[PDB]
Amino acid sequence: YEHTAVIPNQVGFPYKAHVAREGYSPLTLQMQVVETSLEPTLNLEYITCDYKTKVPSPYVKCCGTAECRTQDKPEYKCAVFTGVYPFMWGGAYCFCDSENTQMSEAYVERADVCKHDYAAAYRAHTASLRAKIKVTYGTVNQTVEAYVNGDHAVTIAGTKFIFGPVSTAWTPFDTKIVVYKGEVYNQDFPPYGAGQPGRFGDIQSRTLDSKDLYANTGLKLARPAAGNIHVPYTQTPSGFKTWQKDRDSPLNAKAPFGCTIQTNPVRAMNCAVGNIPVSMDIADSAFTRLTDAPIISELLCTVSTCTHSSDFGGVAVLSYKVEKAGRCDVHSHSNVAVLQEVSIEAEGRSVIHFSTASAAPSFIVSVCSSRATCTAKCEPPKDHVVTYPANHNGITLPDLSSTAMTWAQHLAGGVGLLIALAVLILVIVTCIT
Amino acid sequence: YEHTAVIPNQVGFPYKAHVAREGYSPLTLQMQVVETSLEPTLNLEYITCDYKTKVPSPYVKCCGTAECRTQDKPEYKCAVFTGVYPFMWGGAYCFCDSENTQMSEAYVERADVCKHDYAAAYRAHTASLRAKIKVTYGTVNQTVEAYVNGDHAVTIAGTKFIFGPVSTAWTPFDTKIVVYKGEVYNQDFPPYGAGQPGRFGDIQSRTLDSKDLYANTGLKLARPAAGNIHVPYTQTPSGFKTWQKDRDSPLNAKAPFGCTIQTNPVRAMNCAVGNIPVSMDIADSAFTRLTDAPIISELLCTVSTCTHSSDFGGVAVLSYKVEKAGRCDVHSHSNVAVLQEVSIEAEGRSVIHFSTASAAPSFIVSVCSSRATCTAKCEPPKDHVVTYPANHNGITLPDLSSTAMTWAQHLAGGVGLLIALAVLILVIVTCIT
Amino acid sequence: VAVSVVVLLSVAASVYMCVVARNKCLTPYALTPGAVVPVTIGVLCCAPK
Ligand SMILES: *[C@@H]1O[C@H](CO)[C@@H](O[C@@H]2O[C@H](CO)[C@@H](O[C@@H]3O[C@H](CO[C@H]4O[C@H](CO)[C@@H](O)[C@H](O)[C@@H]4O)[C@@H](O)[C@H](O[C@H]4O[C@H](CO)[C@@H](O)[C@H](O)[C@@H]4O)[C@@H]3O)[C@H](O)[C@H]2NC(C)=O)[C@H](O)[C@H]1NC(C)=O
Ligand SMILES: *[C@@H]1O[C@H](CO)[C@@H](O[C@@H]2O[C@H](CO)[C@@H](O[C@@H]3O[C@H](CO)[C@@H](O)[C@H](O)[C@@H]3O)[C@H](O)[C@H]2NC(C)=O)[C@H](O)[C@H]1NC(C)=O
Numbered sequence: 001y002e003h004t005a006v007i008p009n010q011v012g013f014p015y016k017a018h019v020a021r022e023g024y025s026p027l028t029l030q031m032q033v034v035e036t037s038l039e040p041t042l043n044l045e046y047i048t049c050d051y052k053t054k055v056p057s058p059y060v061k062c063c064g065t066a067e068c069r070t071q072d073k074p075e076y077k078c079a080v081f082t083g084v085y086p087f088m089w090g091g092a093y094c095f096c097d098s099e100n101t102q103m104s105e106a107y108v109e110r111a112d113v114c115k116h117d118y119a120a121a122y123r124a125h126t127a128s129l130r131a132k133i134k135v136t137y138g139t140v141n142q143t144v145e146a147y148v149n150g151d152h153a154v155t156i157a158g159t160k161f162i163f164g165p166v167s168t169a170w171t172p173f174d175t176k177i178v179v180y181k182g183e184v185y186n187q188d189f190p191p192y193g194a195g196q197p198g199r200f201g202d203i204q205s206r207t208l209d210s211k212d213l214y215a216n217t218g219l220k221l222a223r224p225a226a227g228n229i230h231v232p233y234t235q236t237p238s239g240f241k242t243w244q245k246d247r248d249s250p251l252n253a254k255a256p257f258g259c260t261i262q263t264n265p266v267r268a269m270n271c272a273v274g275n276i277p278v279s280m281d282i283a284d285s286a287f288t289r290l291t292d293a294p295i296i297s298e299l300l301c302t303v304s305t306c307t308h309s310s311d312f313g314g315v316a317v318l319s320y321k322v323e324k325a326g327r328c329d330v331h332s333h334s335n336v337a338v339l340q341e342v343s344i345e346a347e348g349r350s351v352i353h354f355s356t357a358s359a360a361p362s363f364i365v366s367v368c369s370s371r372a373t374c375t376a377k378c379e380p381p382k383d384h385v386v387t388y389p390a391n392h393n394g395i396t397l398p399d400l401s402s403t404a405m406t407w408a409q410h411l412a413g414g415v416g417l418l419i420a421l422a423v424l425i426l427v428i429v430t431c432i433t
Numbered sequence: 434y435e436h437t438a439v440i441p442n443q444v445g446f447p448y449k450a451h452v453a454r455e456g457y458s459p460l461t462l463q464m465q466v467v468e469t470s471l472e473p474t475l476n477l478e479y480i481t482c483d484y485k486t487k488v489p490s491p492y493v494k495c496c497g498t499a500e501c502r503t504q505d506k507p508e509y510k511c512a513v514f515t516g517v518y519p520f521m522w523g524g525a526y527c528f529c530d531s532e533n534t535q536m537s538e539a540y541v542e543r544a545d546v547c548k549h550d551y552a553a554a555y556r557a558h559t560a561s562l563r564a565k566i567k568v569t570y571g572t573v574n575q576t577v578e579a580y581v582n583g584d585h586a587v588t589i590a591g592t593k594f595i596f597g598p599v600s601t602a603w604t605p606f607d608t609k610i611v612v613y614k615g616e617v618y619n620q621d622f623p624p625y626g627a628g629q630p631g632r633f634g635d636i637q638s639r640t641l642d643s644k645d646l647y648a649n650t651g652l653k654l655a656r657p658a659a660g661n662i663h664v665p666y667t668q669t670p671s672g673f674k675t676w677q678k679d680r681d682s683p684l685n686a687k688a689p690f691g692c693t694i695q696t697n698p699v700r701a702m703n704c705a706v707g708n709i710p711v712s713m714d715i716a717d718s719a720f721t722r723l724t725d726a727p728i729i730s731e732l733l734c735t736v737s738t739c740t741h742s743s744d745f746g747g748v749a750v751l752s753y754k755v756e757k758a759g760r761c762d763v764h765s766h767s768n769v770a771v772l773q774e775v776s777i778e779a780e781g782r783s784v785i786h787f788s789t790a791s792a793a794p795s796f797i798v799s800v801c802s803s804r805a806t807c808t809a810k811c812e813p814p815k816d817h818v819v820t821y822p823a824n825h826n827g828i829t830l831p832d833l834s835s836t837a838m839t840w841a842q843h844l845a846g847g848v849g850l851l852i853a854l855a856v857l858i859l860v861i862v863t864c865i866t
Numbered sequence: 867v868a869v870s871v872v873v874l875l876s877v878a879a880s881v882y883m884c885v886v887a888r889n890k891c892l893t894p895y896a897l898t899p900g901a902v903v904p905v906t907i908g909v910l911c912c913a914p915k
């Protein structure tokens with residue numbers, strides 16, 4: 001049997017879909033989702049960590065010079081200076097007054113200790129959901145898990161459920177994602193040329209194994225001082241260990257719709273983004289043949305009390321006269337409330353729990369191809385806040401039954417009588433002429 | 434200095450960039466494109482392979498019956514049969530003629546070669562172009578490798594180069610393609626759970642190791658005939674091999690723009706569409722001081738013969754005077770023609786080779802801060818077909834050139850003067866009012 | 867509040883229609899000096915006849 005539905009994507013909200021199928025007692029299905037993770041795809045641009053200035057030993061000579069033979073390393077600057085009188089532990093160094101020469105160099109490598117504490121920069125594209133439902137109907141309720149718009153149509157108990165397609169793929173992601181140890185951020189990372197040092201992404205690498213990191217670290221040498229031996233270098237601080245301070249604002253905080261963010265892989269689960277369309281090819285076996293399910297007649301329902309609560313406010317009891325002992329599914333044919341349960345051991349009395357939103361629960365409640373009207377006034381609650389979501393999601397304000405708009409129903413009145421009769425009296429001198 | 438240019442995205446077309454940077458010796462530069470790999474981002478769901486109907490030896494007995502297990506396996510089929518009395522290698526097997534009962538069972542497991550060939554249903558998306566081009570400005574002849582999305586841009590020879598992003602985000606692909614040993618097929622696939630037997634996708638699995646797998650191979654087993662011990666079973670054959678012999682349309686014979694397909698990873702190559710933005714951060718060191726520039730007075734031009742060809746058909750010698758010689762440059766100041774080399778050797782007179790497609794070009798000249806015109810008529814070539822593409826990307830037919838347009842210039846039409854005479858004789862009709 | 871203002875304009879339109887009916891029923895007794903007006907005296911306050 002082919003039948004579809006449109007359910008909302010909210011964790012824990014129990015949704016009902018009622019099926020009026022021929023030659024069998026009517027059927028009720030219930031479904032609710034829990035882990036609706038939007039696992040996005042991903043891409044890569046580069047990586048970034050701290051650095052280490054690999055300075056070698058210094059080189060001197062006694063009245064003989066040298067030059068900088070090149071060395072294909074990253075940031076291999078070098079220079080050579082004169083006018084040096086280098087003291088040591090044993091005092092003086094050599095005998096050549098003002099002809100001695102100094103040799104030094106510097107070059108920076110991706111520091112080894114960042115192999116396990118790194119930051120990654122990603123571009124990102126469209127996402128795809130993963131719904132995980134309990135399907136809660138007359139056969140021992142099973143759990144299903146699916147990609148919502150792969151249309152990959154998992155099956156349970158002889159029945160083939162397809163899902164989706166999901167609308168607009170609304171994502172809490174920009175297009176320039178950056179990821180740290182257990183967090184994510186939205187930034188504008190520099191496009192593989194670090195036009196500014198002392199920033200984030202100051203040094204880069206295509207992966208953890210690429211053999212050539214790129215650094216615009218801004219490192220120039222200096223001149224050695226008078227007397228002592230050392231190597232003076234002045235370069236900017238590490239842009240990484242100074243970027244880790246000014247993060248201040250994860251996507252974990254400013255995420256809309258409450259999506260919890262996780263890493264390895266990046267994923268956003270339990271989002272209240274829109275809703276889900278579903279279609280069912282329902283197995284013909286799991287029904288019941290209507291000669292066996294009892295046909296209860298001569299019924300009119302009642303009510304007890306109503307509430308604009310959230311959990312389950314209104315309770316309404318029903319009276320019906322049995323003819324054979326059995327069971328039957330129940331349903332409400334409108335959106336103005338939902339029901340706590342699915343079936344009833346239908347022997348005479350029946351207590352059910354509904355949840356109205358605002359003003360007037362006009363009801364059509366069904367029991368095995370029997371309709372019954374129901375209305376009830378309400379008493380609004382007294383509390384302010386609760387610690388759990390709502391179960392009356394079908395928010396509907398208005399109605400018309402015996403209390404709402406009734407003053408308008410008496411207010412309309414008047415005018416037309418006056419004008420019509422007044423003109424049909426006007427004619428009595430203006431139809432003879 | 435910074436400048437921006439465009440370039441047509443094909444192979445072979447030499448492009449010239451003639452920056453007009455006053456106060457210096459002028460400069461043109463050449464870029465030529467030697468690859469365009471266009472890769473999309475793969476996202477697979479399942480694979481395929483021929484199965485193997487693996488069946489164990491059948492359980493036999495007389496003189497009593499048995500039952501069956503149905504453990505967790507792919508498509509566990511089994512049934513017992515009442516009255517199976519066989520023969521054997523010699524004589525018989527039981528003497529319980531009305532109680533000879535035989536059980537049989539078989540299931541489906543992926544074949545041995547399923548570790549070696551498949552068809553991945555790739556849901557690929559969001560292609561991203563690449564390039565391997567070479568640039569030559571003054572003392573440079575070196576090549577470069579560039580991504581063309583707006584991000585990656587580094588350097589060559591101490592100058593900064595940036596390529597892209599693209600003009601029109603077009604792919605020569607679809608959304609839901611399939612791969613094979615070396616090919617690509619732009620077709621649909623079953624939805625991973627609608628594997629109707631015999632067609633494509635009769636068995637599938639998320640990867641090579643998803644230890645549970647879908648199958649709808651219509652397998653059913655019947656009862657054997659008397660005497661011989663065996664087991665019969667019927668199902669449609671392994672539809673993968675049927676799909677092998679009716680492929681009938683690869684992408685390497687149908688893809689547009691001649692952009693050929695390769696795999697591992699799945700990419701396209703040499704796409705002849707669109708243009709590329711490009712921005713240059715060019716350093717000073719390539720330039721030359723206008724003090725040391727070749728000074729050239731009284732520049733003229735002329736032509737010898739034109740060939741309206743594909744190759745560099747036009748030869749135009751160039752008359753120019755001299756007062757001090759050096760290394761000069763040359764460039765065309767329209768889109769109509771193109772020039773062969775980027776420089777001359779300044780000695781008295783030069784020869785250049787220019788190329789066009791319109792038989793009456795007026796590319797003016799540009800030579801070392803001296804611009805002067807020369808126009809030429811042309812003549813179609815004796816040949817019909819060639820074995821190299823065009824080198825004249827400015828295929829712009831209508832030039833004015835005062836050669837065929839001069840007749841339209843001789844469509845002047847002083848009959849407007851005649852109309853003016855008509856209005857004036859109307860006026861002198863009116864002057865006797 | 868818009869319901870309030872549309873009720874006000876509608877009742878004003880009704881009174882306008884009613885008084886215009888009264889005027890178009892009464893005005894043709896303006897001339898003909900002897901103004902002998904019948905038991906329709908429920909309107910048309912008595913002028914010097
Ligand atoms: C505390 O614990 C965490 C969790 O284990 C550690 O984090 C990981 O460190 C390991 C060891 O390096 C990482 O494993 C390596 O990942 C490399 C690349 O990342 C990709 O692959 C992983 C799965 O492996 C994906 O999850 C991820 O998204 C990427 O797709 C792999 O390339 C490495 O594989 C190796 O073998 C191949 C083949 O021989 C080699 O070519 C590789 O070079 C490499 O040797 C390996 O899988 C793991 O990714 C890390 N997890 C993260 C960062 O989340 C921490 O390191 C640990 N703490 C400390 C201090 O070490
Ligand atoms: C099928 O539907 C029934 C509803 O009739 C589901 O039942 C309820 O199931 C949960 C667990 O799934 C029960 O939970 C926990 O039980 C422990 C004791 O084992 C208790 O200490 C916890 O506080 C909690 O109650 C729960 O009791 C049970 N009943 C009610 C009234 O909530 C059932 O889970 C569905 N699925 C299956 C496979 O049966």
Ligand SMILES: *[C@@H]1O[C@H](CO)[C@@H](O[C@@H]2O[C@H](CO)[C@@H](O)[C@H](O)[C@H]2NC(C)=O)[C@H](O)[C@H]1NC(C)=O
Pocket residue numbers: 569574
């Ligand atoms: C740029 O310089 C290179 C060599 O420095 C020139 O050469 C190519 O040389 C390699 C040598 O292995 C050959 O394999 C190629 O076939 C050569 N290519 C060509 C087109 O000749 C190259 O020609 C120079 N570029 C110019 C002159 O434009």
